[PDB]
Amino acid sequence: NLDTSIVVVGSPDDLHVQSVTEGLRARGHEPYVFDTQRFPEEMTVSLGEQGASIFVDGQQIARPAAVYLRSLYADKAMQDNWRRTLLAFRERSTLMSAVLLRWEEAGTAVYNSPRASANITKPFQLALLRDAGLPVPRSLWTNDPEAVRRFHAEVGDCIYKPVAGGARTRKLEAKDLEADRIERLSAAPVCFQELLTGDDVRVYVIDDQVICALRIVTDEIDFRQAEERIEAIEISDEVKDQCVRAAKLVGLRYTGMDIKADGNYRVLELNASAMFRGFEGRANVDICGPLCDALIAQTK
Amino acid sequence: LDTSIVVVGSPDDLHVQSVTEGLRARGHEPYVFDTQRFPEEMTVSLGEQGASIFVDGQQIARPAAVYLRSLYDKAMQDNWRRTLLAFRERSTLMSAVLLRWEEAGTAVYNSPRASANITKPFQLALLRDAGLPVPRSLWTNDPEAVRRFHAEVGDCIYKPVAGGARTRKLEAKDLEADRIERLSAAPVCFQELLTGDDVRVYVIDDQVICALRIVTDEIDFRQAEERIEAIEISDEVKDQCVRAAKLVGLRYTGMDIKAGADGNYRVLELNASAMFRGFEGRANVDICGPLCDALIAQT
Amino acid sequence: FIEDL
Amino acid sequence: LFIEDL
């Protein structure tokens, strides 16, 4: 706690916070856990005008060497007064974000900075990769019923999902193209993508080093219950650099790329905080290891 | 439509009004992008490649220069968890439009990427670390921190961390535990009470447009009005303001600054979408002009 | 439009 | 809240 060189931002109850904290302890580095979730009520943060004047529970933390950013963060208070509650959350979150922005400015290697949030915007992240020579699904974010009917008339079998996440993907069928609900794009835009058929592959990239590429297939084992099987795989070096270009162009140090397979893969999303324990166990592959490696590197 | 100069805001906005009428006075009709009417009365379509941006069928892949003025009740009281998600979907699409343009090479006059460096607890640190004078400040939820700050600094003020309320002066009743201990609900910004003259410096593309002193005069019973009159600043200060605008990453900027007890300036804040109409008049400065000229210069 | 939201 | 005007 007096050695704030490596900071893990997140709750000690979070599994990945535990995994990274332990995997670092095993290498002789006891990280500082910045439990943001408990900030205003049971922790103090104080900022001076000088960038270095950052104080957490009285202790100064001007510039960590590296930060693993898992999360920054009884809400019936919203059901009471939404406006006050929103402004208060904004005060909270502004202070925390300022802490992390100051660390990045001072020179801390934040593993996925909160700046990349801009370049993670789905409709922009895709266009970013696409206009850089990367394969992506024929996509379409719209609020026009007619626009999507031409999208359908062109690409045929396709699906729809939320623009910013918040619901599981649903296959677009003809009853959705009905004037009953296709007019409801009036209330909010929707993402429509072509229906890719090949396999789901996930590629971890940590500081311009493809750590692995894992296949995720499913086996149906019970009534409406299926389980994933992860398989360590090797990838064309062309794509083991095509990926690295995506990570560096979006601005992520540690990323989990999501590709889906024609018979050749296309990039769907880069994840600014992908989990790993699921894959770490379903294919006995190591990701926490290289993450801790990259973290302890910045201390030298 | 000639989508080389786009003005994002509502035609009812007096500022987009000024900018559009100035651009017209110079041989360009902008495409006003009234984004209030996004969900309902307007269609936007984005494809996988960045050029495929369509507003009402008409595509707008790459303007020369954007002037961003804004990007934008009971539906909340009823169901709040879905209202927020709906607003976020609309907002994400609009922001993707703006980011795509900037990535093409559009001169977005103040991009939304600035909203990062805009946050006061980081912007003041940026300016302070670059050697520019900022006021002594403390952003905190720590009553002991506030007590030490008040003792160190003297007269203080407190304002929200991200704005939203009139700043008030710190009094002893506020340091009483009754009030002070409410800092556990959300943090607060405390600052030294600067006691000088309000000054505002306008900067477009690393050129200082003018510097205006803002005073107030009592015209009616408990009613004041602002008098905004021009002053001259040294080339020293002019270069500092240009550097501050560049540090925060803004093209059009109205810098709020202020003398203190010493008659020397402190940058208070840099606005990412400052107004200018109330300033141009009595000062006989023209800001709308230089802004429109800078816009046309990108075409 | 998306029910699960 | 502390800022009573929010």
Q: Which DSSP string do the residues of A38-93 spell out, in sequence order? A: GHHHH--EEEESSTT-EEETTEE----SEEEE------HHHHH-HHHHHHHHHHHH
CB-based contact B291:B109 (threshold 8 Å): yes
Residue in chain A closest to C3 (alpha carbons) equals A167
- Best A45, A90, A124 residue to mutate vs chain B (most B CBs within 10 Å): A124
Task: Give the Å distances, CA to CA, from A94 to A53, A57, A99, B123, B135.
Answer: 16, 18, 9, 12, 19
Question: Which of B109, B84, B97, B95 lies closest to B51, judged by CA?
Answer: B97
Our CA angle for A135, A139, A140, nearest 5°, is: 155
* Chain C touched by A116 (CB under 8 Å): no
Chain A partners (3+ C-beta pairs within 8 A): B, C, D
* Chain D touched by B186 (CB under 8 Å): yes
Q: For chain A, what is the radius of gyration of the CA atoms?
A: 22
Of the partner residues A40, A94, A105, the one whose CB lies closest to the CB of residue B184: A40
CB-based contact B240:B251 (threshold 8 Å): no
H or E element: which one contains B258? strand B252-258
Task: Say how far apart CA B84 and CA A85 lie, in whole Å.
Answer: 13
Question: Which of B63, B275, C3, B123 lies closest to A105, judged by CA?
Answer: B123
* Strand B252-258 relative to strand B198-204, pairing: antiparallel
End-to-end CA distance of chain C: 9
- Taking each helix axis from N to C terminus, what angle separates A288-298 and A15-25, rounded to the nearest 10 degrees? 60
Q: B-chain residues within 8 Å CB-CB of C5? A: 82, 85-86
Does the beta-carbon distance from B142 to A46 stay under 8 Å?
yes
Report which DSSP code applies to A270. Answer: E
> CB atoms < 10 A from the CB of B118, how many?
20
CB-based contact B68:B108 (threshold 8 Å): yes
One-letter amino acid of A120: I
Does the beta-carbon distance from C2 to A187 stay under 8 Å?
no
* Chain D touched by B179 (CB under 8 Å): yes
H or E element: which one contains B189? strand B188-192
Name the CA dihedral angle for B223, B285, B106, A118, rounded to a multiple of 10 degrees: -30
> What are the tokens at B241?
């303001």
Q: Three-class SS of residue A104?
A: helix
Specify which residues A206 forms β-bridges with. A254
CB-based contact A132:B108 (threshold 8 Å): no
H or E element: which one contains B45? strand B44-47
Chains A and C touch (3+ CB pairs under 8 A): yes
Residue in chain C closest to A183 (alpha carbons) equals C1
> CB atoms < 10 A from the CB of A224, how many?
5
Task: Give the Å distances, CA to CA, from A221 to A280, A282, B9, B48, B58.
Answer: 21, 16, 55, 37, 51
> What are the tokens at A217?
């297939």
Q: C-chain residues within 8 Å CB-CB of A181? A: 1
Task: Give the Å distances, CA to CA, from A247 to A252, A290, A293, A295, B101.
Answer: 5, 16, 18, 17, 21
* Chain A touched by D1 (CB under 8 Å): yes
Name the CA dihedral angle for B33, B36, B37, B42, rounded to a multiple of 10 degrees: 40
Task: Say how far apart CA B275 and CA B231 lie, in whole Å.
Answer: 19
Task: Say how far apart CA A137 and CA A149 lie, in whole Å.
Answer: 17
One-letter amino acid of B10: S
Q: Three-class SS of residue B231?
A: coil
Task: Say how far apart CA B126 and CA B133 lie, in whole Å.
Answer: 11
Our CA angle for A145, A148, A149, nearest 5°, is: 85
Residue in chain D closest to B167 (alpha carbons) equals D3
* Chain D touched by B193 (CB under 8 Å): no
CB-based contact A45:A99 (threshold 8 Å): yes
Does the beta-carbon distance from B39 to A164 stay under 8 Å?
no
Question: Which of A88, A92, A98, A10 lies closest to A47, judged by CA?
Answer: A98
Report which DSSP code applies to A132. Answer: T
Q: Which residue has the tokens 């954007």?
A: B66
* Chain D touched by A87 (CB under 8 Å): yes
Specify which residues B227 forms β-bridges with. B215
CB-based contact B118:B248 (threshold 8 Å): yes
Of the partner residues B48, B88, B128, the one whose CB lies closest to the CB of residue A49: B128
Query: What method was applied to determine this entry?
Result: X-ray
H or E element: which one contains B153? helix B143-153
Q: Is A269 annotated as a binding residue?
A: yes
* Chain C touched by A184 (CB under 8 Å): yes
One-letter amino acid of B20: T
Q: C-chain residues within 8 Å CB-CB of B86? A: 5
- Give the residue extent of every domain in chain A: 1-112+276-300, 113-136+197-275, 137-196
Task: Say how far apart CA B47 and CA B123 lie, in whole Å.
Answer: 35
Report which DSSP code applies to A288. Answer: H
> What are the tokens at B37?
């009417």
> CB atoms < 10 A from the CB of B233, how many?
16
Q: C-chain residues within 8 Å CB-CB of B90? A: none
Ordered strands of the B5-8 beta sheet? B31-33, B5-8, B65-68, B107-109
End-to-end CA distance of chain B: 15
**Residue partners of B268: CB distance under 8 A and separation at least 6:** B134, B135, B194, B256, B257, B258
CB-based contact A143:B57 (threshold 8 Å): no
Ordered strands of the A59-60 beta sheet? A59-60, A54-56, A45-48, B137-140, B188-192, B156-159, B168-169
Task: Give the Å distances, CA to CA, from B178 to A115, A182, A193, B149.
Answer: 38, 55, 56, 19
> CB atoms < 10 A from the CB of B162, how many?
20
Task: Say how far apart CA A127 and CA B99 lie, in whole Å.
Answer: 10
One-letter amino acid of B58: Q
Report which DSSP code applies to A182. Answer: G
Q: For chain B, what is the radius of gyration of the CA atoms?
A: 22
> What are the tokens at B130?
């670059």
